[PDB]
Amino acid sequence: MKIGIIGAGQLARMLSLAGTPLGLEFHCLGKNGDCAEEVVKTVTDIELTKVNDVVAWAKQFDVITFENENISHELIKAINHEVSVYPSAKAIAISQDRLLEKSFMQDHGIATAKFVNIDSLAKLQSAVDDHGLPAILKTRRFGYDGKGQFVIRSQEDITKAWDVLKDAPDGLIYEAFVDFDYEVSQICTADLKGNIAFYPLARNTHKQGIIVESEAPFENVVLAEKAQQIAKILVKEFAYVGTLAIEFFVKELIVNEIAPRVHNSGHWSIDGAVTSQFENHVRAIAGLILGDTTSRKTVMLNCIGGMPATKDLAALDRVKIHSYNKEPRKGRKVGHLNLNLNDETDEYQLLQVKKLIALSEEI
Amino acid sequence: MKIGIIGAGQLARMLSLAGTPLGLEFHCLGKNGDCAEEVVKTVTDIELTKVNDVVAWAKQFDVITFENENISHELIKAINHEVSVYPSAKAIAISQDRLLEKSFMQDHGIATAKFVNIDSLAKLQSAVDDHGLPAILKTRRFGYDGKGQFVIRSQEDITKAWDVLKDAPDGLIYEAFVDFDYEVSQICTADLKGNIAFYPLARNTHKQGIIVESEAPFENVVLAEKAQQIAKILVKEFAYVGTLAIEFFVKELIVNEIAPRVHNSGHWSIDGAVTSQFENHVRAIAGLILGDTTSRKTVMLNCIGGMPATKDLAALDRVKIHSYNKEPRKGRKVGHLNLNLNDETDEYQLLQVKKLIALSEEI
Numbered sequence: 001m002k003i004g005i006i007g008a009g010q011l012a013r014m015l016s017l018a019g020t021p022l023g024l025e026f027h028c029l030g031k032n033g034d035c036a037e038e039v040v041k042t043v044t045d046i047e048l049t050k051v052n053d054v055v056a057w058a059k060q061f062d063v064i065t066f067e068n069e070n071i072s073h074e075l076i077k078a079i080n081h082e083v084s085v086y087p088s089a090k091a092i093a094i095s096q097d098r099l100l101e102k103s104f105m106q107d108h109g110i111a112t113a114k115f116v117n118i119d120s121l122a123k124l125q126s127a128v129d130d131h132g133l134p135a136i137l138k139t140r141r142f143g144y145d146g147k148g149q150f151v152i153r154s155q156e157d158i159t160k161a162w163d164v165l166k167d168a169p170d171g172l173i174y175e176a177f178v179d180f181d182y183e184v185s186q187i188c189t190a191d192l193k194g195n196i197a198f199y200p201l202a203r204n205t206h207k208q209g210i211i212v213e214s215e216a217p218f219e220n221v222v223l224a225e226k227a228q229q230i231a232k233i234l235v236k237e238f239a240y241v242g243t244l245a246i247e248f249f250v251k252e253l254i255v256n257e258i259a260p261r262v263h264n265s266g267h268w269s270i271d272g273a274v275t276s277q278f279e280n281h282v283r284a285i286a287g288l289i290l291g292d293t294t295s296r297k298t299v300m301l302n303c304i305g306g307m308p309a310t311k312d313l314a315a316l317d318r319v320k321i322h323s324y325n326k327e328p329r330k331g332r333k334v335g336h337l338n339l340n341l342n343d344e345t346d347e348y349q350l351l352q353v354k355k356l357i358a359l360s361e362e363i
Numbered sequence: 364m365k366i367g368i369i370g371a372g373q374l375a376r377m378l379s380l381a382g383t384p385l386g387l388e389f390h391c392l393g394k395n396g397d398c399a400e401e402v403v404k405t406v407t408d409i410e411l412t413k414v415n416d417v418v419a420w421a422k423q424f425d426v427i428t429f430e431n432e433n434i435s436h437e438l439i440k441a442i443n444h445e446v447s448v449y450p451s452a453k454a455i456a457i458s459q460d461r462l463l464e465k466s467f468m469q470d471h472g473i474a475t476a477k478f479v480n481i482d483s484l485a486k487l488q489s490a491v492d493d494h495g496l497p498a499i500l501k502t503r504r505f506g507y508d509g510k511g512q513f514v515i516r517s518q519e520d521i522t523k524a525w526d527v528l529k530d531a532p533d534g535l536i537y538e539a540f541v542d543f544d545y546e547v548s549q550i551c552t553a554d555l556k557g558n559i560a561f562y563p564l565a566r567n568t569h570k571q572g573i574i575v576e577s578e579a580p581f582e583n584v585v586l587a588e589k590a591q592q593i594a595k596i597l598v599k600e601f602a603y604v605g606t607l608a609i610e611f612f613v614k615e616l617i618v619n620e621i622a623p624r625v626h627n628s629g630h631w632s633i634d635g636a637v638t639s640q641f642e643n644h645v646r647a648i649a650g651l652i653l654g655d656t657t658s659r660k661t662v663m664l665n666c667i668g669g670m671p672a673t674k675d676l677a678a679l680d681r682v683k684i685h686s687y688n689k690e691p692r693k694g695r696k697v698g699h700l701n702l703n704l705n706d707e708t709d710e711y712q713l714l715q716v717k718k719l720i721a722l723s724e725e726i
């Protein structure tokens with residue numbers, strides 16, 4: 001069986017690392033210098049606007065998936081008509097647009113930040129009059145890791161926010177700034193028949209808009225049950241197949257956003273679960289029964305901008321190293337480290353690895 | 364850092380799977396259709412007799428290793444003079460020749476099967492007169508998985524054995540047939556400074572000359588200590604860097620043979636140890652500190668000749684699947700399965716997977 005992946009970044013790289021021992025063959029749509037290249041059968045560079053060419057490429061394979069939900073949902077529809085794409089175009093369409101994503105939650109009685117679609121300065125003023133400050137003016141369709149938005153803290157920030165973002169193609173959304181206690185995510189995988197394998201909750205820490213640490217299992221039986229029920233609603237309404245990620249605020253579970261894919265907050269599962277989020281995404285789309293997800297306490301630390309020297313990491317002999325072999329650039333995800341946490345030696349190694357990261361990080 | 368591997372088979376494939384997340388780049392010497400191709404940066408097909416060409420290829424990389432010790436030890440010397448090869452030419456030279464291997468053990472007071480170098484029919488007759496029957500006439504330099512030899516059970520089998528094998532290039536050895544209770548192997552990894560990371564003993568079952576099952580940890584504190592001391596002698600005398608495998612008969616530890624490489628009897632460590640034999644071979648040759656080897660009860664089952672359907676394997680959701688994506692051929696190693704053994708559900712899945720294997724196996 002051949003699996004085509006749109007994208008050749010680190011998520012594609014790890015899908016192939018996880019899925020290759022199952023005997024599956026991986027092919028990417030992306031560039032020669034992208035980090036999945038060395039671990040997949042082929043990489044083919046086709047502009048995603050050239051729809052018939054992309055569809056022609058896809059038809060070489062038995063099933064298609066993707067690593068970035070910001071892709072054209074029409075392109076996915078076009079492909080899916082010829083060869084199965086997982087997960088669904090509906091999941092992509094709703095998750096990639098902040099207004100559609102939040103409206104979906106509201107339509108099913110699921111809590112989110114208060115939000116308003118913004119089509120004018122007057123509408124934004126009204127949204128601020130109604131739901132208060134601080135708030136964020138975000139684009140509906142652009143943006144990664146806190147970028148492409150404007151935090152509104154005062155009445156003067158309003159016109160400034162509008163003036164910066166007003167011309168964003170495909171529009172804008174006001175979100176009330178949620179004052180959360182902490183953040184958690186629910187990652188799960190739905191197989192071809194809609195059976196869901198759940199991971200425990202992970203507690204995630206963001207720094208400057210980017211995830212820097214993820215801890216699992218986060219043990220709270222009540223929140224976990226609420227999280228799982230929301231996941232089930234999503235899987236059913238999207239007819240979802242694959243790994244799905246839902247990020248929450250806790251303060252009451254409040255949905256932050258969803259990602260129809262393997263997600264950074266699940267990277268711990270490579271070394272902390274019997275079957276990782278990556279192996280299970282692959283098994284899901286391949287029409288296979290999912291792997292057991294029994295998990296053990298693990299911490300995941302992100303390497304942003306830079307990464308400690310491998311020789312320094314290797315000296316901490318229980319740390320599991322996940323370098324993506326990417327180019328260091330301020331703010332860029334270049335790798336992560338996982339560590340199982342059982343005893344005091346693990347705590348000691350964790351301190352040493354955090355120190356190493358503090359010296360290599362560039363956000 | 365770039366690592367060159369001579370060979371593109373499943374051992375090379377798994378070295379790259381283990382070592383790629385460390386941020387290392389892998390290149391093989393072998394063919395396009397070989398099973399490591401899809402997980403390494405490049406594969407280059409050069410006949411190993413063309414020494415200057417092989418050396419020219421090797422010089423593109425920072426360190427060289429190999430998956431098959433039957434390679435020309437002179438070729439390794441030639442390469443090593445220009446770029447570091449691990450492990451050593453001495454380890455290759457002794458392990459690849461049954462007479463040299465057994466003579467080494469005898470020279471250091473380490474037990475083996477009684478053995479005699481055979482250069483004539485009369486010498487074989489004398490070896491049988493001295494050390495008895497049953498015995499095996501083996502080549503010194505050829506043979507895999509019980510092939511290329513002749514078991515001598517009677518006095519008529521003697522001339523038959525001689526007539527079959529007498530012209531083997533590089534000679535023959537008589538070995539007394541050891542009547543063992545069971546077999547175990549000691550796998551360990553020595554870093555660049557000679558520090559050794561030990562795995563627990565594994566209990567191995569052979570069927571028709573091929574390994575079919577490996578169980579670890581095999582708990583016997585006395586045998587383990589003897590095994591580790593023998594490993595230390597080998598690492599020191601060979602100035603060994605890398606993963607090393609020693610196979611024993613138990614009946615008293617008696618050395619059977621050694622392999623200067625990752626070995627089938629250590630495949631369990633992919634899913635049963637904090638750091639696998641593959642990741643540690645890579646860390647050793649890369650000049651890195653070795654990973655922790657804390658282990659949990661695991662069984663490894665070999666898929667020979669054929670492999671059960673992936674959909675049938677996936678249904679047993681705790682089994683870890685390791686398909687090499689190779690072509691089924693009677694007697695050929697095409698994959699393995701690992702299973703952690705904790706509770707009764709694991710025992711149940713193990714029975715089901717053994718049944719699946721019995722129906723797919725072709726030895």
Ligand SMILES: Nc1ncnc2c1ncn2[C@@H]1O[C@H](COP(=O)(O)OP(=O)(O)NP(=O)(O)O)[C@@H](O)[C@H]1O
Binds near residue numbers: 113145178179210257
């Ligand atoms: N309304 C809000 N109130 C408070 N914090 C928020 C709000 N919206 C977003 N954030 C935080 O900002 C982070 C970045 O969101 P976003 O700009 O969508 O980045 P992203 O690409 O989705 N990265 P990630 O959330 O880690 O997958 C979120 O994970 C939250 O921690």
Ligand SMILES: Nc1ncnc2c1ncn2[C@@H]1O[C@H](COP(=O)(O)OP(=O)(O)NP(=O)(O)O)[C@@H](O)[C@H]1O
Binds near residue numbers: 507510538546569627
């Ligand atoms: N003298 C002996 N007496 C009894 N059994 C033996 C003897 N020599 C070899 N064997 C058995 O035959 C097997 C095959 O040995 P060999 O022909 O060298 O295959 P191999 O390629 O080294 N495969 P492996 O030992 O699994 O790495 C050994 O693993 C032993 O179980």
Ligand code: NA
Binds near residue numbers: 038040043401
């Ligand atoms: Na490739």
Ligand code: NA
Binds near residue numbers: 095096097101257258
């Ligand atoms: Na989203």
Ligand code: NA
Binds near residue numbers: 038402403405
């Ligand atoms: Na390749």
Ligand code: NA
Binds near residue numbers: 458459460464621622
């Ligand atoms: Na040997």
